[PDB]
Structure 1
């Protein structure tokens, strides 16, 4: 019977439109009887759709406020207030933007040097280190073509061990062909956070970023 005012995603906050806040109410018993109220009525189009996707014999109501990113980047505290008929005190919860926001530090690491003599594929790595809100968005580019999200594997954003503040980390790997690397294409990781001016840090690597033997024979 709990209440969660889940924040917008980071996708539509950078590119798209429907920056919807998701006030989910999970674990109520009978059938219905909900009432959802919010504080900034700026396009209030109340949808609920109470599904069976609830994991128990107690349903959910996933309320949505649509079209709000202009109030979100400002920082007005959005407050979701749900009246459910099994009590009279409403489930009230609030959330806003985060206070400390550090910015990512993209590092596009090259292929490891033993992968190139196998001639199968090569492995580009994109570490993104030290951001203070948790949400991040990694994209990859070849030339200037955005690659679709089933060609690269992206791990989660976990907390790193720090004796500074609460900072995080992300890794994304792209295995690309050996001939496309060996010819000399340019591959770019693009890490997007809400704590950047241009909202997309981008790094780029190609094949081009000394043996010197001396035979002292006899």
Structure 2
């Protein structure tokens, strides 16, 4: 689950989240989004089909998805999640989440030299 690009936050409209799943052998999959605990309806996002990825080892597949949420809900500290269902997972679902932190850097060094 990838954080939004920083060029997007300067227009105050809607931020964009991106989910990617890669490298699974039977090509059937599900993708569901959340906000907190409330599962969102399906008419609010967009997922692509499941193409085949170009390696030389075996045959594997991939799929993407995007969800655009409002800027005011992003700056408050609301969290959002992405879930994927596959036949070959042991507990049939796996989940990743995000919020307005975790893209911020760990340290900033500024120096101003008056010489």
Q: So what's the TM-score if we normalise by structure 2?
A: 0.92
Offset of residue 162 of structure 1: 1.3
Structure showing greater relative contact order (alpha-carbon pairs closer than 8 Å, 6 or more residues apart)? 2
Distance (whole Å) between structure 2 residues aligned to residue 115 and residue 159 of structure 1:
30
Q: How far does the alpha carbon of each residue in 1:2-58 deviate from its partner, in whole angstroms, 9 at most, with x for none?
A: xxxxxxxxxxxxxxxxxxxxxxxxxxxxxxxxxxxxxxxxxxxxxxxxxxxxxxxxx
In the alignment, does 2:109 pair up with 1:216?
A: no
Aligned to 2:112, what secondary structure does the other structure show?
A: coil
Gaps spanning 5+ residues in structure 2: where? Answer: none
Gaps spanning 5+ residues in structure 1: where? Answer: 1-107
Offset of residue 212 of structure 1: 1.8
Offset of residue 136 of structure 1: 0.5
CA RMSD across the alignment: 0.9
Q: How far does the alpha carbon of each residue in 1:110-160 deviate from its partner, in whole angstroms, 9 at most, with x for none?
A: 111111111100000000111110010000010011111111100111111
Which runs of at least 4 in structure 1 moved beyond 2 Å after TM superposition? none
Aligned residue-pair number: 111
Distance (whole Å) between structure 1 residues aligned to residue 55 and residue 5 of structure 2:
27
Aligned to 1:181, what secondary structure does the other structure show?
A: helix
Offset of residue 163 of structure 1: 2.0
Greater strand content:
2
The answer for the alignment partner of 1:117 in structure 2 is 10
Offset of residue 204 of structure 1: 0.6
Q: So what's the TM-score if we normalise by structure 1?
A: 0.50
